[PDB]
């Protein structure tokens, strides 16, 4: 239905941003295409992306009102669908996905991009279960010409968002993305999100800051990954662990089945 490609089936919906499976009549190659009708910026960021744990951009076509963004197809679906509610997933799978997630985030941060909405719905799987960080509609540049800019816009998804974003006028980009990786890791290992939002008026968040790890979800989590979560989910962003230091963590380097 667009030039050489047939639009075969709906892969996912969105806020005026639907994604279709697209197959080339000539060559049979299947990709994914996002149909939308701001996106200049998104396209600009998408064209920068070249890494095995990040979704690839193939190109775009405007056809009147509708813009078509042609992107890598992740035929394994989302990480969201591999997480069993109240259980999670086997720790070795969770570690491998975490490794890949960190590789993606290091890449993005190294090109000065912050994703700002890391969560299991946006973490897609290829056919060999390699994880790909997808959806750059909230992404932005936080480093340009080697100069950092602080962020001030609120975005993300509350249960994944770092607390400084609810409390500070301006904050550093990178620790926000790290925080959301720790909520992802929590979800993979326990099959449940720990709080609705990281605010002191939220009892489960208060409980975590008082170290009540005999409660859920923390009691489902082995002590080694939990020690890593204690370094990631730290309320002050300048004391929170950085990715270089995550890579030296004991669990991160533990050999697992
Ligand atoms: C075959 O490739 C995929 C399969 C599935 C999947 O598991 N489905 C397909 C949809 C299916 N139902 C959907 C509703 N329909 C009426 C009945 C069938 C349920 C099962 C989900 C995603 C697939 N691939 C895919 N790759 C790249 C993405 C992307 N998704 N989307 C939708 C994204 C989702 C979140 C964030 C980013 C993306 C994205 O940008 N792309 C390009
Ligand atoms: Cl969950």
Residues 6+ apart with CB under 8 A from 70: 5, 22, 31, 32, 33, 57, 58, 59, 60, 61
Q: How far is the CA of 119 from the centre of ligand 1 (A)?
A: 15
Give, for 19, the enclosing helix (H) or strand (E).
strand 17-24
126 is catalytic: no
Q: How many residues does the chain have?
A: 257
- Ligand 1 atom closest to Cα of residue 122: 36
Residues within a 6 A CB radius of ligand 1: 10-12, 19, 21, 32, 34, 55, 71, 73-75, 77, 121-122, 124, 134-135
How many beta carbons lie within 10 A of that of residue 131, not counting itself?
A: 24
Residues 6+ apart with CB under 8 A from 188: 79, 83, 88, 89, 93, 94, 97, 98, 120
Structure-determination approach:
X-ray
DSSP string, 98-122: HHHHHHHHHHHHHTTEE----SGGG
How many beta carbons lie within 10 A of that of residue 140, not counting itself?
A: 18
> CA 88, CA 75: separation in Å to the nearest integer?
21
* Architecture label for domain 85-257: Orthogonal Bundle (1.10)
DSSP string, 172-204: -SHHHHHHHHHHHHHHHHHSS-S-SSS-TTSHH
The catalytic residue among 4, 6, 81, 117 is 117
Domain boundaries, the chain: 1-84, 85-257
Q: Are 201 and 228 in contact (CB under 8 A)?
A: no
Residues 6+ apart with CB under 8 A from 87: 190, 191
> CA 206, CA 39: separation in Å to the nearest integer?
38
Q: CATH number of the domain at 1-84, out of 3.40.50.2300, 3.10.20.30, 3.40.605.10, 3.30.200.20? A: 3.30.200.20
The reported resolution of this PDB entry, expressed in Å, is: 2.0
Over 29-97, what HEC string results? CEEEEEEECCHHHHHHHHHHCCCCCECCEEEEEEECCEEEEEECCCCCEECHHHCECCCECCHHHHHHH
Q: How far is the CA of 29 from the centre of ligand 2 (A)?
A: 33
Count of CA atoms in the C-beta half-sphere (13 A) of 249:
23
Residue owning tokens 């890449």: 107
């Amino acid at each position: 239905f667009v030039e050489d490609w047939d639009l075969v089936q709906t892969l996912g919906e969105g806020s005026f941003g639907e994604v279709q499976l697209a197959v080339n009549r000539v060559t049979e190659e299947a990709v994914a295409v996002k149909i939308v009708d701001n996106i200049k910026k998104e396209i600009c960021i998408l064209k920068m992306l070249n890494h095995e744990n990040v979704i690839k951009f193939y190109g775009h076509r405007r056809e009147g009102n509708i813009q078509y963004l042609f992107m890598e197809l992740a035929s394994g679906g989302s990480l969201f669908d591999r997480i069993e509610p109240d259980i999670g997933m086997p720790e070795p799978d969770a570690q491998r996905f975490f490794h890949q997630l960190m590789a993606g985030v290091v890449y993005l941060h190294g090109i000065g991009i912050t994703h700002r909405d890391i969560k299991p719905h946006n973490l897609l799987l290829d056919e060999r279960d390699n994880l790909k960080i997808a959806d750059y509609s909230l992404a932005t540049v936080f480093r340009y010409n080697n100069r950092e800019r602080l962020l001030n816009k609120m975005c993300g998804t509350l249960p994944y968002v770092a607390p400084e974003l609810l409390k500070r006028r301006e904050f550093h980009a990178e620790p926000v993305d790290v925080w959301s990786c720790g909520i992802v890791l929590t979800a993979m290992l326990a099959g449940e999100l720990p709080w609705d939002q990281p605010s002191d008026s939220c009892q489960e968040y208060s409980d975590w800051k008082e170290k009540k790890t005999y409660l859920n979800p923390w009691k489902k989590i082995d002590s080694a990954p939990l020690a890593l979560l204690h370094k990631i989910l730290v309320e002050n962003p300048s004391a929170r662990i950085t990715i270089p230091d995550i890579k030296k963590d004991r669990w991160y380097n533990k050999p697992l089945k």
